[PDB]
């Protein structure tokens, strides 16, 4: 048997006809060579267009494109009949949708730019599906999804007796769009009559006094979680709420979102941290494809199986490979943990601004290792990191030595005129051009494809990857990253992990990665700094300690114990009040790698 359609997508935001000669396409194109119309020129909007009705799918044009603004795929003709939306020819296409459901929490996992957000607009009444045809009605949608639960969704959606509220993929829009306080706002947006429960469970009663612009990450995020629920809506769609929440927060916010299911309200969630995902969801979707060419949502799965299958890279329900190797993790017995040479040591420091107090106990820094920083936000993880960084001078003690520090700040904002390549190039041209930084850093984080746009003209997730890469291409003794986790997806999060681990181990250098995402910690960490006290008041930084002994020490203050999943190997969070929860906590070992 056989059957096959060709599908061409050109990321125009990457095409530039004047730089590659004169549309390198039509020139290099074999079909056009022999008097054909595979690639046509839009001599007006000045773009190239591939008439899929021709294109043999030989892929010559793809290899030639000086950038990589072309993708040509040969489909078996099947998924093509389940086609949802095309943004015009040579443009992004969606196949299938996530199946939302009442009274249940429908999970989503899968890398950015695969039209997670495309589906949200579709469901929000603000975009009619064309079903990759020409449609501008609901009725063909309702038919196409006949045999499935989403027909019923589009019928209600059109009567307009449901409207979903959406927590946007980037936040930090509400501070520059909505002025005055968190106190104020939360009265205004109120319509659900559940004001009391929300503000208390998400612990924003201290956070009312400050204005939006004065918030820290964890707080701003949570205040959006609050204001979305106080708007009246049955359907709540959270895109990336894991941004900037700490370990303590993200587990507690998960409980808050889960309590919605019991109230019988429909939650749809994107999460990129498997422990948090396991815990919330009841259905799970995998989304596969290469970003910006196509995305296809898989069939709904039961959370556990769905996650297993994501890790394997092979779908047994759909028969699709989408990653040619497996997601994997590092215990502590899959390493050599041997002692190394002391780089520097720091005595007792104590910094008091007079609006937070920190005491740092005496500690050793070793060379060649990767230290993870853990604790809840405002516990002065950041105050410590900034004392070595030079932006803050210790009140007492010394950390500011003849180590050079490379500093990735907590927020990201751009102030740089010129391209991604200008910005990096002036730091160390040399590094950019070597094969290691190309295998480990630049190439898998997409930066080769990003050199053409300005820094200001990059979006949050691309720009994050760009900041991270920048900080590690600085020439330093010791590398300081404050919270790189924010706006990274699962695959990205992992890629940054393998890059940090390799680069630091090879040149035997120190890095501090302030961390809160379970998986990155699980792979990268050699040693740990657990923070305690009461946040927003006092923090006590306890000296560096082993990875296991640290996650043990800390997990016991969160009530939440972690196992090792037996299906394919991942961090398994155990429900507070379970067999494993009870066995770990009784036996003083609160964690396994």
């Amino acid at each position: 048997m056989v059957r096959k359609m060709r599908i061409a997508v050109i990321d125009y935001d990457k095409c530039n006809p004047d730089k590659c000669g004169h549309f390198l396409c039509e020139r290099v194109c074999p079909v056009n060579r022999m008097g054909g119309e595979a690639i046509i020129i839009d001599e007006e909007n000045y773009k190239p267009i591939i008439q899929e009705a021709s294109c043999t799918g030989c892929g010559i044009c793809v290899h030639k494109c000086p950038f990589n603004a072309i993708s040509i795929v040969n489909l078996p003709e099947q998924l093509d009949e389940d086609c949802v939306h095309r943004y015009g020819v040579n443009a992004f296409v969606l196949y299938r949708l996530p199946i939302v459901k009442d009274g249940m929490v429908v999970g989503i996992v899968g890398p950015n730019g695969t039209g997670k957000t495309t589906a949200v607009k579709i469901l929000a009444g603000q975009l009619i599906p064309n079903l990759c045809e020409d449609n501008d009605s609901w009725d063909n949608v309702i038919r196409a999804f006949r045999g499935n639960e989403l027909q019923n969704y589009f019928e209600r959606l059109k009567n307009g007796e449901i409207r979903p509220v959406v927590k946007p993929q980037y936040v930090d829009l509400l501070p520059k769009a909505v002025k005055g306080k968190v106190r104020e706002l939360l009265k205004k947006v109120d319509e659900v009559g559940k004001f009391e429960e929300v503000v208390k469970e998400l612990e924003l009663e201290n956070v009312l006094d400050r204005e939006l612009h004065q918030l820290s990450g964890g707080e701003l995020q949570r205040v959006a979680i609050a204001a979305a629920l106080l708007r009246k809506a049955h359907f709540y769609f959270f895109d990336e709420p894991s941004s900037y929440l700490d370990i303590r927060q993200r587990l507690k916010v998960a409980r808050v979102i889960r309590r919605l299911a019991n109230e019988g309200k429909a939650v749809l969630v994107v999460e990129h941290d498997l422990a948090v995902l396991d815990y919330l969801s009841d259905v799970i979707h995998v989304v596969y494809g290469e970003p910006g060419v196509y995305g296809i949502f898989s069939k709904p799965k039961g959370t556990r199986n769905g996650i297993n299958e994501f890790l394997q890279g092979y779908l047994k329900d759909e028969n699709v490979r989408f990653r040619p190797y497996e997601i994997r993790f590092t215990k502590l017995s899959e390493r050599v943990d041997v002692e190394r040479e002391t780089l520097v040591e720091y005595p007792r420091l104590v910094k008091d601004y007079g609006s937070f107090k920190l005491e740092v106990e005496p500690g050793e820094i070793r060379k060649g290792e990767v230290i993870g920083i853990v604790g809840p936000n405002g516990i002065g993880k950041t105050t410590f990191v900034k004392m070595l960084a030079g932006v803050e001078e210790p009140t007492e003690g010394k950390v500011e030595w003849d180590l050079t520090v490379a500093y990735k700040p907590q927020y990201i904002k751009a102030e740089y005129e010129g391209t991604v390549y200008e910005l990096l190039s002036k730091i160390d041209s040399s590094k950019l051009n070597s094969n290691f930084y190309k295998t480990e850093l630049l190439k898998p984080l997409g930066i080769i494809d990003l050199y053409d746009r300005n820094v200001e003209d990059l979006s949050g997730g691309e720009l994050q990857r760009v900041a991270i890469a920048a900080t590690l291409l600085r020439d330093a003794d010791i590398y300081l990253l404050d919270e790189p986790s924010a706006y990274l997806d699962v695959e990205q999060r992992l890629a940054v992990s393998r890059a940090i681990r390799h680069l630091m181990e090879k040149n035997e250098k120190t890095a501090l990665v302030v961390e809160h995402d379970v998986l990155m910690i699980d792979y990268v960490s050699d040693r740990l700094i657990v923070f305690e006290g009461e946040p927003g008041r006092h923090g006590r930084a306890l000296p560096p300690m082993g990875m296991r002994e640290g996650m043990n020490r800390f997990l016991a203050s969160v009530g939440i114990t972690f196992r090792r999943d037996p299906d394919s190997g991942r961090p398994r969070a155990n429900k507070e009040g379970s067999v494993k929860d009870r066995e770990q906590k009784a036996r003083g070992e609160y964690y396994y790698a």
Partner: protein, 357 residues
Amino acid sequence: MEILEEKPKEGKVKVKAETLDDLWHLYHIIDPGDIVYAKTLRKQAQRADSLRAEKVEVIPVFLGVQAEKINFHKFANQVRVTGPIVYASREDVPLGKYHTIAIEQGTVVTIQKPRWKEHHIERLKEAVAASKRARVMIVVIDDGEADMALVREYGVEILNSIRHNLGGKRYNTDRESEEMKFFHDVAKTMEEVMKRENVEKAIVAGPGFVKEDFYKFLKEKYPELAKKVVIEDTSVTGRTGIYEVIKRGVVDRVYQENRVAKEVQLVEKVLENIARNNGLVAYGLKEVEEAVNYGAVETLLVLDELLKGELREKVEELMDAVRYSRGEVVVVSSEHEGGEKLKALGGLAALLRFRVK
């Protein structure tokens, strides 16, 4: 085809058709203003009463038909030429009618009254009478004789019929130094013919040990030109032993496919890697037309369907010019792993020696 030219003026030729391409040759020569005589059969229609009833008939023998249209038909493999009769037997008086006929296998005479051109006589002789080849090189080596044949569609002949004059084991042990001598001779004669005819395998077959015995000796003597042993069926020798080896032995057809297929994909890989090199790839009617005139094309790879396209003339010329320049031109099935990419590439791909812009 097989040609016999029976008259020095081409007033009598005797021609045949065995293969699809032979007919295309026969088409290409035959025009308006020829008469072909042949040897068909055209029937009558008779008789009848006072009025009209049922009844028909048939007859046999040759004839000639004038050329009035020249038409070429698929799923039939037959070139029809229609129009008026002018030669028949008269014993019944059956003249006074037209009569279509088809040029096929068996005798077909061609003549042209204003008299043929150089191009016409040349076209005929272009297809080679003896054998154009396909492999067409089979051996059978048994205790009593060594045999070795050239079996083409155009005719069929055991090339060597030399005798061992010896047993396998029956006269004594027969592991003579006149057996060692014999085998060396056998190998030599086969080696010289195989190269000369330019088809590169032979199938050895035989009884008992003997077939194997010989392959072992060939490999041990010199590195081969490609040799395979197949068991096949043998339990006779002479014309019918060679004939029996060929009949159940789709070995011939299957091997000839695998060898052509090999050549395309070897070249295919090369084109991939050359495309990276600046100015040494040609591809794309204009580019290829441009190297071929400047005489710098090493290899021309074209799927056979493009030869039978809608533009056919250009393709042949590009090949003709390259072959004259001592490139090699490759004509290959589109079923193949390499052939399917020459469709995609568009049709023409060529490897250059040196840059043509």
